[PDB]
Amino acid sequence: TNAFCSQFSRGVYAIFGFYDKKSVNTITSFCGTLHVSFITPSFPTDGTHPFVIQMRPDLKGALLSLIEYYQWDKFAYLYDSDRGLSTLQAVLDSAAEKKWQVTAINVGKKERRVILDCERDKVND
Amino acid sequence: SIQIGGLFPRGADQEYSAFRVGMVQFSTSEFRLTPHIDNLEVANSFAVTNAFCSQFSRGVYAIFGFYDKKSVNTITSFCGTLHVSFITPSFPTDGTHPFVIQMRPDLKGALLSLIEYYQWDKFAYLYDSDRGLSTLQAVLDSAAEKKWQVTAINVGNINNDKKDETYRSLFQDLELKKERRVILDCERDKVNDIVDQVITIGKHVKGYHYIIANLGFTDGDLLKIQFGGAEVSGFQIVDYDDSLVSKFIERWSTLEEKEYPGAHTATIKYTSALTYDAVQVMTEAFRNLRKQRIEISRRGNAGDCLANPAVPWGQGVEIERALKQVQVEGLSGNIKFDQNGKRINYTINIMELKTNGPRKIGYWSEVDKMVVTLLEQKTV
Amino acid sequence: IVDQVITIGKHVKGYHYIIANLGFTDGDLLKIQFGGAEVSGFQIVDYDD
Numbered sequence: 065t066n067a068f069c070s071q072f073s074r075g076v077y078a079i080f081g082f083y084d085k086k087s088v089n090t091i092t093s094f095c096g097t098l099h100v101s102f103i104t105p106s107f108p109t110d111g112t113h114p115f116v117i118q119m120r121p122d123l124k125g126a127l128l129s130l131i132e133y134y135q136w137d138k139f140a141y142l143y144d145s146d147r148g149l150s151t152l153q154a155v156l157d158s159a160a161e162k163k164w165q166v167t168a169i170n171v172g173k174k175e176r177r178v179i180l181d182c183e184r185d186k187v188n189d
Numbered sequence: 190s191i192q193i194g195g196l197f198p199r200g201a202d203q204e205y206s207a208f209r210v211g212m213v214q215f216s217t218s219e220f221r222l223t224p225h226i227d228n229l230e231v232a233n234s235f236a237v238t239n240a241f242c243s244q245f246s247r248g249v250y251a252i253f254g255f256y257d258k259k260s261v262n263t264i265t266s267f268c269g270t271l272h273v274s275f276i277t278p279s280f281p282t283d284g285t286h287p288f289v290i291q292m293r294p295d296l297k298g299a300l301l302s303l304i305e306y307y308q309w310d311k312f313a314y315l316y317d318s319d320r321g322l323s324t325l326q327a328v329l330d331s332a333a334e335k336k337w338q339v340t341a342i343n344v345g346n347i348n349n350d351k352k353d354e355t356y357r358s359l360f361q362d363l364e365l366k367k368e369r370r371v372i373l374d375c376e377r378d379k380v381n382d383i384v385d386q387v388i389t390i391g392k393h394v395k396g397y398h399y400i401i402a403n404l405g406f407t408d409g410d411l412l413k414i415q416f417g418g419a420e421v422s423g424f425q426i427v428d429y430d431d432s433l434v435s436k437f438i439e440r441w442s443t444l445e446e447k448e449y450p451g452a453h454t455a456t457i458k459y460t461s462a463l464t465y466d467a468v469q470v471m472t473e474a475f476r477n478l479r480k481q482r483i484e485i486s487r488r489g490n491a492g493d494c495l496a497n498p499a500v501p502w503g504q505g506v507e508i509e510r511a512l513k514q515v516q517v518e519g520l521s522g523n524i525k526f527d528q529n530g531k532r533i534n535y536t537i538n539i540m541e542l543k544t545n546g547p548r549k550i551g552y553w554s555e556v557d558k559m560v561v562t563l564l565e566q567k568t569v
Numbered sequence: 570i571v572d573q574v575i576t577i578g579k580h581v582k583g584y585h586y587i588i589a590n591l592g593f594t595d596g597d598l599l600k601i602q603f604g605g606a607e608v609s610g611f612q613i614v615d616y617d618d
């Protein structure tokens with residue numbers, strides 16, 4: 065908030081930057097309010113929020129199509145709560161239609177198929 | 190005079206009414222609580238920030254209010270930074286964040302204990318993302334650990350204008366998987382919608398079991414699904430059998446509707462009761478501060494909330510602890526807080542819906558888990 | 570009666586109800602519309618005229 069207000073007070077025409085799941089609402093709200101465009105490599109906003117340019121493309125469709133490609137029915141989905149649950153909720157909503165059995169584990173049954181969904185460092189760990 | 194800021198969402202009439210009633214009941218000659226009320230859209234981070242900065246610039250000693258999942262991070266961050274204690278009836282924060290006093294007890298443990306009580310290994314979890322996903326993570330971890338079959342579906346994203354079509358569709362999905370057991374962890378209106386659709390399609394008959402996961406079970410409308418034959422279980426944090434709650438209701442049911450909106454009824458939503466209890470907690474907190482001869486009085490103006498660098502006032506911590514050491518008896522039963530602002534040593538009544546109306550079959554203690562409370566045809 | 574039928578769940582497929590009154594569309598038909606039961610009635614007011 066302080067950084068945004070500082071950059072705004074300076075009179076910038078645009079703001080490039082990053083946000084977390086705890087700071088995303090501040091960015092989207094303030095940028096939607098002051099008509100100041102925000103550019104970000106971070107995760108796409110969940111919604112239609114304006115004045116936010118997300119460089120990162122959506123991963124939901126490719127992931128679901130990949131799961132359907134390998135013909136997976138039962139698998140385990142590891143997820144980081146520090147990063148977010150959006151894709152998890154997506155595959156959970158898609159689980160009924162595609163007949164999936166998902167075992168969700170938060171990393172923040174003879175299971176041989178695992179989805180990681182984490183930071184590159186956490187993935188490396 | 191002790192200046193405090195109130196933050197109320199647009200449309201919470203009964204909560205603000207219970208706030209005023211709580212102000213009248215707990216008023217004293219020792220000191221006088223002076224609320225500054227801000228009615229706003231609680232889901233708006235900008236409005237919440239502006240209101241917070243306003244109350245802070247005014248120099249309030251404490252802030253009571255509500256928050257959504259979109260504005261909660263702002264509250265926790267600003268309160269943790271500027272050391273301004275926040276009091277709330279809303280959902281418990283996911284974490285240990287400081288300067289946040291949550292009146293709402295944790296519902297996850299009671300929910301899990303209820304799931305284990307009916308011995309469910311396979312069910313459906315319908316949930317709203319507006320409060321938090323922590324409970325979802327809980328039932329998922331318990332689904333994995335206890336080897337269950339849970340179908341979690343998010344109904345939060347669906348638009349209300351075209352909603353009945355997707356409802357019919359989702360129920361077609363639930364009739365596909367032969368799902369007869371459903372848990373609603375949703376907003377009361379969302380719960381009403383889902384219930385209405387269940388009734389419409391006829392899944393409210395015998396063989397179906399619904400668990401309404403909210404603090405109040407009797408706060409919503411139970412009459413329409415009462416004679417259906419389906420088992421309906423829920424939770425109740427406000428026990429109307431207590432003499433305190435009995436008297437409070439005796440006065441609450443007679444209150445003027447013109448002056449106090451939604452305050453003429455025999456029942457009260459748990460949020461409003463938690464508001465009342467919150468007023469009580471604040472009163473006791475400042476009373477204890479005055480009893481300990483600890484001076485919290487502001488020397489000068491609090492200044493701008495965005496002042497760089499941000500230096501927190503010193504007595505804020507004193508106020509925070511003063512709020513967290515309070516142990517009293519309210520509408521929500523025993524009110525006692527741990528150091529993180531969470532409710533401890535509370536009791537959540539487990540309710541079942543019968544033909545003669547809702548009935549308590551037991552209760553869930555904070556440490557004791559779930560404990561139960563202890564026309565036939567002829568045989569030839 | 571409709572509310573009670575819906576409540577107990579007799580508004581599903583296999584049931585047929587005949588409303589004997591001049592207006593069929595005068596009341597709320599939405600609640601028994603998605604039940605699956607066949608519902609027949611009478612209409613003296615033709616809105617197509």
Ligand SMILES: *[C@@H]1O[C@H](CO)[C@@H](O)[C@H](O)[C@H]1NC(C)=O
Pocket residue numbers: 516523525534556
């Ligand atoms: C809860 O607090 C009450 C007093 O308010 C006390 O008598 C009781 O022993 C406590 N129980 C537990 C389980 O902590």
